[PDB]
Amino acid sequence: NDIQWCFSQVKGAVDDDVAEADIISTVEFNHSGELLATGDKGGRVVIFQQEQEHSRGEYNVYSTFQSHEPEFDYLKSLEIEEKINKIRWLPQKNAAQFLLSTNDKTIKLWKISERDKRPEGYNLKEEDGRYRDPTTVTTLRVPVFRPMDLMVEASPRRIFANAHTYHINSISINSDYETYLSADDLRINLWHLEITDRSFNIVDIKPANMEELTEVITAAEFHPNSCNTFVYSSSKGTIRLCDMRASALCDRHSKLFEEPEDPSNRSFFSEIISSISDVKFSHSGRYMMTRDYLSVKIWDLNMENRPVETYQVHEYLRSKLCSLYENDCIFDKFECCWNGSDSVVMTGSYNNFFRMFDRNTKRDITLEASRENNKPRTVLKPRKVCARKKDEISVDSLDFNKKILHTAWHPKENIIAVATTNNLYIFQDKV
Amino acid sequence: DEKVFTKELDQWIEQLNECKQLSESQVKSLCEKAKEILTKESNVQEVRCPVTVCGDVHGQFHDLMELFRIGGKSPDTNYLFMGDYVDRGYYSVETVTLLVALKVRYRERITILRGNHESRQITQVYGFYDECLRKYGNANVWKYFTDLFDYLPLTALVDGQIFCLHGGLSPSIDTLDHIRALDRLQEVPHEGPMCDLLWSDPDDRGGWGISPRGAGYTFGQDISETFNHANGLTLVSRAHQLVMEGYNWCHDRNVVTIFSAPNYCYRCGNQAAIMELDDTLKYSFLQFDPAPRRGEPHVTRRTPDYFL
Amino acid sequence: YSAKPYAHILSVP
Amino acid sequence: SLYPIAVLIDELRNEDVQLRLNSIKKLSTIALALGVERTRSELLPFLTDTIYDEDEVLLALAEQLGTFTTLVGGPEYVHCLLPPLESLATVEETVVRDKAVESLRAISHEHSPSDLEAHFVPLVKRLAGGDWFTSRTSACGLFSVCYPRVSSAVKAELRQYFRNLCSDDTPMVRRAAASKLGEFAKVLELDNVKSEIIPMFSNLASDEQDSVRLLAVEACVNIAQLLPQEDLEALVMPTLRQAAEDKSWRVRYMVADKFTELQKAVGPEITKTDLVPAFQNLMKDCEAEVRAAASHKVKEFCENLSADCRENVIMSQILPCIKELVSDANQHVKSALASVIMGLSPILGKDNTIEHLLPLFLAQLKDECPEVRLNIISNLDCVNEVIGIRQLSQSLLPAIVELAEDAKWRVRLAIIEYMPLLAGQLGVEFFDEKLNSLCMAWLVDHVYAIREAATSNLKKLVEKFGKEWAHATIIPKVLAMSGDPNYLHRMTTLFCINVLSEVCGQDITTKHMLPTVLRMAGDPVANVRFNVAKSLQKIGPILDNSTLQSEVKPILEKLTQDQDVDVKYFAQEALTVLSLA
Ligand SMILES: [Fe+2]
Ligand SMILES: [Zn+2]
């Protein structure tokens, strides 16, 4: 039945000192699954490598670097944050690894490589310990290579900057191994992975009169297989699927996915809670999952009028919408992810809770990412929230400062990474 | 020899014309000789008609080349810039270097005043220091240029009838003798007549006022009329405010604001203008658009070659 | 809603 | 003296990128000083796997390794260069990989066939079978250099390896295979091209990736040039027909962009039967880029049609589509059509041009876009030889006038740059009657760039129309600007005199232009005065030495006493250059 999730690892400070710069803002596995990268608010990217001797090894620190630095836009006299918005791994070209890291304005291509040898031997001097007198040398010696302890290097290969007027919210690589897209609030640009001085603006929904603004782009993503298909979601709860074969500019959407507005549950907040914060293509590519504030919707790419599935993440927050609006919690941008076989979907919630939904069995579980269970191979108890029986949690006792916004699934195994405000938890199943 | 230095300065000018910087020693020598030239110029410089009065360029080198295309090349055309040669631009270093080189080579043909951005604090905050550090790897160039900026004249007088300055009038300033009595060989203050002359603004509110800029005061039509009547000035040319049409009249054809940076901050989409004063004080405004270019990111809706 | 999360889109110097 | 070469060797380890780049660009000196055996056994192992990852350093190293055939010991030991290049063919940088592949191809020719089969073919097999798709991408470009010079068994192995590469999982390897398919098929036997190259070409042309499918058009061009005409219908033509109707606009754009090459390759009969409807459909395509690409090819495609039915095809099948392309919504489609529609006049003839092409010429001359009008005007050479330009003068004059007085000064500059051609084509009388006023009014434009362009235009017009026309028409008009109350126009007069003195002649310069140059030396504005000094410096060589010693020298001497520093400096420069003092 349900997967027996167990505590495996925790990475971060043992205290509650968030420091506001160590807060994780993105979690991502690579294509093989052995590497796990996290970016934080301070602009740092940390890569953990699975211990290789199916594979249930632990993750240890593999690399660390400063992806982005704080900047100042003199052109607008505004502080440009170094917070890492998205990290996307590229398919493995050679022995090195590559990723794309984006802040609000700039995308960077980073190469992570291992070096295990160094040059040895000198002509005009010794090994930097002393210099040699001129004319003393009468025999050339070409430097040789000698092994050294393995050390990991991270270097920025290409910078894609100054192309987005607004804050970038999405980057997505194309299946052709050649291009990718970056999407800010109102425009989607297409980049070539080896060209930094120009980009192709494929989508532009900026109105002529800015006081007539009604929609913004909240997420965008390429199809996992099809090289011509991509989707982008908006703050109105609609997803536009664009085909790049029809025309050079994708201003005319091929498909429009939107559910009819239910007049039953109308409220003052129905416009805010209907905004889509994340859209993810299934691994098979035949389904599409969108996350709004209160629910997770699964759409068949052949049916546009309604989703095929709808799961309610946290229904007990429906009566507490005003309170969540007062403290700006209603504007949180949660995420969602599929499993390897597109059968289970995982998303986050409040009070360090994350939700698993099984599509085959229609069973949902709530689990807690807490350090109080800091014992490896310990089964996580399911959690229940009461609107108070035994082992239940009252709604008014939930901590809304503890949000699980970023989660990742291992592309092949049953390993999940869950980012709380300051710690990163890695959970495995009972194997 | 004078001839060797003149030839070197010329070659510096043509080198700068394609937007490439100089060496640290070249910049230091240029700044030193520019200071030697400027230490003799009065606070209220006497400029002889005919002359082309230019507004802010704010480090837009290509728009400065467009300005030279519109109005002519120095020394054939007599120019008069009103400050703000740096900050908020991709090529502030090249722009200020070319302007200083032209001033040194053609001191009688080009007159450059001091803008509110010719300060050590402002240049560090708004990217001139950042740009020079990025292009050189040290703060020597910034130090030299900020040392030079102190010597720039505060104001200019054309034919004894047109008053050219960056900011505008000051409550503690009533006669050109008061302006000449100030000490301009210093950093721009946070208060006082010297700061007001570079931070003031015209306004429709009568009398003086409070400038939202944090420095200087806003004056009405009555103040400008009184100043013109007292000093016998036909017109006050002014800058430092962005205008979409390039040039704007105000205070009953007594103050004219000229902005010479088209597409201000590469985003405002405004027009630029330059005011040509003929042999008989006959003013005529030439408006121009940004010089065609691509920008460092060439973001376009036309399909690029890699996708074609 | 066009004020709290939007902000920077509508805000222009 | 081995000190400089020791410095060069040690600079290879330097942390400075520039020092390593300079030392890499001088590896020839290091290898020459080391010798032959030393380079083989010491320098090459050090260069085999370099730790530094700079793209420019790797590119320089890849370029250098392609010329070490002599330094390593000649063709006998040339295989010693295989390892250092092979690693360079694996890096993530496309340009470095391409340079390494080019160097490998360059040094493959020095291999003996035994060495080709013993060292180079194993290298190609290793790269093609590598675990990293950068190696497989690089391996696609190495098959054609080693195929012709190996045995039949090795040829079969290479063909199988290329077939495996054409079916690779990653799209980049398939793109590389599609790119190299034509040059590989060029060296295969015809039977193997029909038997093996054709199935790979068909499979790649129906790929899922658009970037791979669009690479099949060039392969179609290359393959069609090898097969006989009778085989094109059975083998090549269905793939081309499928490509012309492809869903992706990029494949159709590639088809339209290489339409003349396809027309030459397939031949006239297939062009009439198949390519004419394809061109008609491409000109009516729903994508503006495809329509523009097809519009660029109209003249060349129509010109190369078989002369037996060329006119009928153009007038009954191509012309109706051009008529709709004239009124297109897209600016660039209209510009592309305007840049080439002018050249259909010689093909059709006088009567057909008058009846059919002339309305299109008028419609494109009255277009709102300045670029369309400029493109139409720039290409009047072809029409001028079919129908006299006197018939088009009354329609060209309003367009030239509209372009010459545009609000945007760059449009005026663009129409200025074409003025000498229009003046030459339209004749002297028409220019004097109508176009003279425009040229004279350009010199007093507000924008200085327009004045300079008009000055150069005056120079070219003088060069074209001779000295007498310039003397009779423009010179009394350029001299009248000396009295302008604006000093800019006076300097414009001086600049016009400066540029005219080169060509107009010595006698006329001494008799007419000189009296005004010397007269403006007393101008109140110092700018005019030192421009007069520069003018006398420039036109000095044209004048006879007696004139310089008579009137130029006293004027320069007087200018050396001017109050302005610039006037004195430029007068002194003129005196020194002319050696008058
Ligand atoms: Fe200013
Ligand atoms: Zn300013």
Domain boundaries, chain D: 283-387, 502-581
Given CA atoms D422, D427, D433, D439 in this order, what sign does their dihedral have?
Answer: positive
Name the neighbours of A, counting chains with at least 3 Cβ pairs within 8 A. B, C, D
Distances (CA, A) of A276 to A293, B15, D30: 8, 54, 63
Report the alpha-carbon distance of residue B235 to residue B162 in Å, rounded.
5
Q: Tokens for D43?
A: 């320098």
Would residue B83 count as lying in a domain? yes
- Using a CB–CB cutoff of 8 Å, tell me whether B292 touches chain A: no
**DSSP notation for A52-102:** -----PPEEEEEEEE----EEETTTTEEEP----EEEEPP--SSSEEEEEE
Report the alpha-carbon distance of residue B307 to residue B285 in Å, rounded.
44
Contact between A216 and A185 (Cβ < 8 Å): yes
Report the alpha-carbon distance of residue A272 to residue D429 in Å, rounded.
75
Contact between D500 and D476 (Cβ < 8 Å): no
Of A76, A185, A328, the CB nearest to C4: A328
- Give the gap in angstroms from C-alpha C8 to the nearest C-alpha of chain A: 8
Query: What is the rounded radius of gyration, in angstroms, for the C-alpha atoms of chain A?
Result: 24
Could you tell me how many CB contacts below 8 A there are between chain A and chain C?
23
The torsion defined by the Cα of A48, A53, A55 and A58, in degrees rounded to 10, comes to -40
- Phi/psi of residue A222, each to 5°? -80, 160
Answer whether A198 sits within 8 Å of B298, measured CB to CB. yes
CA angle A152, A157, A158 (to 5 degrees): 150
Instruction: Consult the annotation and say whether B62 binds a ligand.
Output: no
- Give the gap in angstroms from C-alpha A182 to the nearest C-alpha of chain B: 12
Instruction: Report the SS3 class of residue B221.
Output: helix
Per-residue buried b or exposed e for D520-544, using 16+ beta carbons within 10 Å of the residue's own CB:
bbebebbbbbbbbbbbbbbbbebbe
- Which of A115, A424, D265, A96 is CA-nearest to residue D239? D265
The CB density around residue D43, as the number of other CB atoms within 10 Å, is 24
Report the alpha-carbon distance of residue A9 to residue A59 in Å, rounded.
8
Report the alpha-carbon distance of residue D384 to residue B28 in Å, rounded.
61
Chain A residues touching residue B266 (CB < 8 angstroms):
75
Report the alpha-carbon distance of residue D443 to residue D416 in Å, rounded.
11
User: Helix/strand/coil (H, E, C) string of D369-409?
Assistant: CHHHHHHHHHCCHHHHCCCCHHHHHHHHHHHHHHHHCCCCH
The CB density around residue B296, as the number of other CB atoms within 10 Å, is 12
Q: Is D479 left (phi over 0), alpha (psi -120 to 50) or beta?
A: alpha
First to last CA, chain D: 54
The class of domain D283-387 in CATH terms is mainly alpha
Chains D and C touch (3+ CB pairs under 8 A): no
Report the alpha-carbon distance of residue D202 to residue D212 in Å, rounded.
12
- Give the gap in angstroms from C-alpha D574 to the nearest C-alpha of chain A: 47
- Give the gap in angstroms from C-alpha D545 to the nearest C-alpha of chain B: 27
Provide the residue count of chain B: 308
Helix (H) / strand (E) containing A379? strand A378-379
- Which of A334, A326, A322 is CA-nearest to residue A419? A334
Contact between D456 and D443 (Cβ < 8 Å): no
Burial of D391 (0-12, 13-18, 19+ CB in 10 A): exposed
Residues of D with CB under 8 A from a CB of A: 2-3, 5-7, 9-10, 12-13, 33-34, 38, 42-43, 45-46, 49, 51, 53, 90-92, 94, 132-135, 170-172, 208-211, 247-249, 286-289
Burial of B183 (0-12, 13-18, 19+ CB in 10 A): exposed
- Using a CB–CB cutoff of 8 Å, tell me whether B307 touches chain A: yes
Report the residue of D8, D9, D24, D137 to disrupt the A interface, i.e. the one with the largest count of A CBs within 10 Å.
D9
Burial of D81 (0-12, 13-18, 19+ CB in 10 A): buried
Closest residue in chain C to residue A206, using alpha carbons only: C9
Sheet with A336-338, edge to edge strand ranges: A336-338, A344-348, A353-358, A363-368
Chain D residues touching residue B107 (CB < 8 angstroms):
565
Report the alpha-carbon distance of residue D13 to residue A143 in Å, rounded.
8
Would residue B303 count as lying in a domain? no
Report the residue of A72, A73, A74, A197 to disrupt the B interface, i.e. the one with the largest count of B CBs within 10 Å.
A74
The torsion defined by the Cα of B298, B301, B302 and B305, in degrees rounded to 10, comes to 50
Contact between A54 and A66 (Cβ < 8 Å): no
- Using a CB–CB cutoff of 8 Å, tell me whether A156 touches chain D: no
Report the residue of A112, A116, A122, A140 to disrupt the D interface, i.e. the one with the largest count of D CBs within 10 Å.
A140
- Distance from the alpha carbon of residue B84 to the mean position of ligand 2, in angstroms: 5
Contacts 24+ apart (CB under 8 A), B240-244: B240/B56, B240/B82, B240/B83, B240/B84, B240/B115, B240/B116, B240/B166, B240/B167, B240/B198, B240/B199, B240/B201, B241/B201, B242/B268, B242/B270, B243/B270, B243/B273, B244/B268, B244/B269, B244/B270, B244/B271
Cis before B50? omega within 30:
yes
Contact between A416 and A406 (Cβ < 8 Å): no
Provide the residue count of chain A: 431
- Using a CB–CB cutoff of 8 Å, tell me whether B29 touches chain D: no
- Using a CB–CB cutoff of 8 Å, tell me whether B300 touches chain A: yes
Running DSSP on this structure, what letter comes out for residue D575?
H
Q: What is the resolution of this structure in A?
A: 2.7
Distances (CA, A) of A304 to A85, A259, A299, A301, D313: 30, 8, 8, 7, 47
Instruction: Consult the annotation and say whether B240 binds a ligand.
Output: yes
Would residue B153 count as lying in a domain? yes
Q: Which residues pair with A37 in a beta bridge?
A: A28, A47
For chain B, what is the domain count? Answer: 1
Distances (CA, A) of B102 to A220, B12, D206: 51, 10, 63
In this structure, whether the domain defined by A5-113+152-429 belongs to CATH 1.20.1370.10 is answered with no
Report the alpha-carbon distance of residue A345 to residue A364 in Å, rounded.
10
Report the alpha-carbon distance of residue A280 to residue B12 in Å, rounded.
57
Report the alpha-carbon distance of residue B88 to residue B57 in Å, rounded.
10
The class of domain D502-581 in CATH terms is mainly alpha
Q: Regarding beta strands B298-300 and A195-204, do their DSSP bridges make them parallel or antiparallel, or are they unpaired?
A: parallel
Per the structure, the complete domain to which residue B44 belongs is given by 2-288
Chain D residues touching residue A194 (CB < 8 angstroms):
94
Give the relative orientation of helices D389-404 and D419-426 as an angle to the nearest 10 degrees: 150
Would residue B70 count as lying in a domain? yes
Alpha helix positions (H), D427-486:
428-430, 436-442, 448-473, 475-479
Contacts 24+ apart (CB under 8 A), D318-327: D318/D276, D318/D279, D318/D280, D319/D356, D321/D280, D321/D283, D321/D284, D322/D283, D322/D298, D322/D360, D323/D360, D324/D284, D325/D283, D325/D291, D325/D295, D326/D360, D326/D363, D326/D364, D327/D363
Of D42, D209, D286, the CB nearest to A142: D42
Contact between A40 and A23 (Cβ < 8 Å): yes
First to last CA, chain C: 21
- Distance from the alpha carbon of residue B47 to the mean position of ligand 2, in angstroms: 22
Q: CA neighbours within 13 Å on the CB side: how many for D299?
A: 15
Answer whether B297 sits within 8 Å of A77, measured CB to CB. no
- Distance from the alpha carbon of residue B297 to the mean position of ligand 1, in angstroms: 28
- Using a CB–CB cutoff of 8 Å, tell me whether A195 touches chain B: yes
Would residue B247 count as lying in a domain? yes
Q: Domain-by-domain residue ranges, chain A?
A: 5-113+152-429
- Which of D113, D99, D5, D114 is CA-nearest to residue D55? D99
Of B6, B73, B279, the CB nearest to D485: B279
Q: What CATH number is given to the structural domain containing B122?
A: 3.60.21.10
* B251 is an active site residue: no
Chain B residues touching residue D530 (CB < 8 angstroms):
75
- Phi/psi of residue B266, each to 5°? 60, 15
Give the relative orientation of helices D17-24 and D27-34 as an angle to the nearest 10 degrees: 60
Domains D283-387 and D502-581 fall in the same CATH topology = yes
Q: Regarding beta strands A353-358 and B218-219, do their DSSP bridges make them parallel or antiparallel, or are they unpaired?
A: unpaired
Point out the catalytic residue in the list B117, B178, B190, B229: B117
The CB density around residue A136, as the number of other CB atoms within 10 Å, is 7
- Distance from the alpha carbon of residue D318 to the mean position of ligand 1, in angstroms: 61
Tell me which ligand sits closest to the C-alpha of residue B201. 1
- Using a CB–CB cutoff of 8 Å, tell me whether A341 touches chain D: no
Closest residue in chain D to residue B292, using alpha carbons only: D410
Report the alpha-carbon distance of residue D1 to residue B259 in Å, rounded.
64
Q: Tokens for A160?
A: 């894609």
Give residues 102 to 161 of A whose Cβ lies within 8 Å of B.
160-161
Q: Which residues pair with A287 in a beta bridge?
A: A300
Burial of A396 (0-12, 13-18, 19+ CB in 10 A): exposed
Cis before A411? omega within 30:
no
Instruction: Name the experiment that determined this structure.
Output: cryo-EM
Report the alpha-carbon distance of residue B108 to residue D198 in Å, rounded.
77
Report the alpha-carbon distance of residue D200 to residue D179 in Å, rounded.
12
Distances (CA, A) of A148 to A64, A117, A118, A125: 20, 5, 6, 21
Burial of D410 (0-12, 13-18, 19+ CB in 10 A): middle
Would residue B304 count as lying in a domain? no
- Phi/psi of residue D423, each to 5°? -65, -40
Of D94, D135, D247, the CB nearest to A245: D247
Helix (H) / strand (E) containing D5? helix D3-11
